[PDB]
Amino acid sequence: TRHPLQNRWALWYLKADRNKEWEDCLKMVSLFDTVEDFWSLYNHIQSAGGLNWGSDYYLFKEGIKPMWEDVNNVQGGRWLVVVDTQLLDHYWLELLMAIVGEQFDEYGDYICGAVVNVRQKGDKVSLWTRDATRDDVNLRIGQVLKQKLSIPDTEILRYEVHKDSSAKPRICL
Amino acid sequence: GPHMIRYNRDTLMTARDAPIPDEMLQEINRVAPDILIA
Ligand SMILES: C[n+]1cn([C@@H]2O[C@H](COP(=O)(O)OP(=O)(O)OP(=O)(O)O)[C@@H](O)[C@H]2O)c2nc(N)[nH]c(=O)c21
Ligand SMILES: [Cl-]
Ligand SMILES: [Zn+2]
Ligand SMILES: [Zn+2]
Ligand SMILES: [Zn+2]
Ligand SMILES: [Zn+2]
Numbered sequence: 627t628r629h630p631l632q633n634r635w636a637l638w639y640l641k642a643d644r645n646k647e648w649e650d651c652l653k654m655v656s657l658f659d660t661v662e663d664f665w666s667l668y669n670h671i672q673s674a675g676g677l678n679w680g681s682d683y684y685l686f687k688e689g690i691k692p693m694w695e696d697v698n699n700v701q702g703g704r705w706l707v708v709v710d711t712q713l714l715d716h717y718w719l720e721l722l723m724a725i726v727g728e729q730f731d732e733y734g735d736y737i738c739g740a741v742v743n744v745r746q747k748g749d750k751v752s753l754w755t756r757d758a759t760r761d762d763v764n765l766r767i768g769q770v771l772k773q774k775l776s777i778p779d780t781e782i783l784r785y786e787v788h789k790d791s792s793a794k795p796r797i798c799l
Numbered sequence: 800g801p802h803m804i805r806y807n808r809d810t811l812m813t814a815r816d817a818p819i820p821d822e823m824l825q826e827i828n829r830v831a832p833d834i835l836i837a
Contacts, residue, residue, distance in 0.1 A: 629814060632804045639831045655834075656826045661811060666819040671827065672834040720808075727806035734803065774808075 629661035632728045634688040635739075637667060642680030649693065657688060664726055674718040675711035677744045685722060686739030692754070694788040699738055703758035703787040703796065705768050707777065709749040717751045717775050718742045724774040725753075731770070736763050751775075758787040761797060768799045 637655045640648075655671075658664055674683060684692035693699065707717060721740045728734050738754040753771055755764055764785055772783060785797035806814075818824075819837055827835045 629806070630804060631806075639834060641831075641833070653830045655831045656823050658823075661806060661814050662816075663820065663823065664811075665815045666817070666823060667827075669816070670819050670823075670835065670837045671831075672836060677834075723806075723808055723811050727808070727811055728803055729805065729807065 627662065631659050631661065631664070631726050632734070633726070634659035635664075635685055635726060636688055637671075638682075638684035638686065638692050640682035640684070642678070652684075652692070659688075661726075664722075668719070668722070673715045674742045674744060674749070675715045679744055679746050681744050683718070683742050684739055685725065685741075686754075687737070690738050692739055692741065694792050698756060699754060699788055701758060701789075702738060702754060702756045703764070703785055704741070704752040704754045704791075705764070705771055705799075706784050706786055707751040707771075707775065707781075709751065714742070714744075714749045714751070717777075720775045721751060721753065721771070724770065729770060729774065730767055733763050733767055736760070736767065754788075758785075758789075758796060764797055765799070768797065772799060 636657045639653055639655050640651045643651050686692045690698040736756045741752040743750040783799045784795035787796050
């Protein structure tokens with residue numbers, strides 16, 4: 627039984643270390659490109675809710691580093707979902723299933739990857755996209771995101787441009 | 800050529816299973832031992 631995915635994905639993990647620069651905390655853990663390997667990986671690593679504070683997971687397409695500075699991200703941005711543990715785990719897994727299952731219709735090429743940040747101030751789940759200048763694309767992606775994660779209409783999601791994060795939302799939903 | 804390969808939520812959930820591939824175990828243990836549950 628082998629079910630190939632459209633894309634090959636890499637899980638990255640960031641463990642907080644106050645004596646390292648940000649990029650030096652980031653490690654590429656494993657790549658996968660089948661449904662079977664997706665579940666093998668997910669089922670045998672700590673859930674997002676079980677990560678220590680300051681830790682991150684990133685799931686990005688093969689060849690895209692989960693950095694603003696990556697050529698694939700530099701002109702891009704993210705949809706941001708703020709939380710405030712089962713809800714966080716749910717947001718993360720629903721998002722992973724939506725991206726590896728290619729559930730963003732004709733806009734899959736604009737998906738770079740997903741991010742979960744575990745933080746005392748409030749956990750964050752984000753979807754990084756390729757081109758912050760395409761409001762039409764990003765809006766549709768945002769609508770699928772809210773639908774797949776069962777986010778209430780009253781929770782207003784922000785689309786943030788990476789160039790701004792590196793230095794106010796471009797879109798709100 | 801063929802269409803995009805898609806899996807909706809129900810299909811992925813039904814496919815969800817078991818040991819992991821040894822190559823995967825090796826990789827996780829080597830770079831992120833603290834997240835491994837296996
Ligand atoms: C995603 N990302 C995060 N950082 C570093 O991590 C910080 C953002 O950190 P964070 O994106 O992990 O969120 P956090 O909730 O911790 O941020 P906060 O609300 O400002 O406390 C930035 O100030 C950078 O120093 C980054 N630094 C670089 N160079 N490139 C990146 O892509 C990048
Ligand atoms: Cl879920
Ligand atoms: Zn492969
Ligand atoms: Zn769920
Ligand atoms: Zn077909
Ligand atoms: Zn067709």
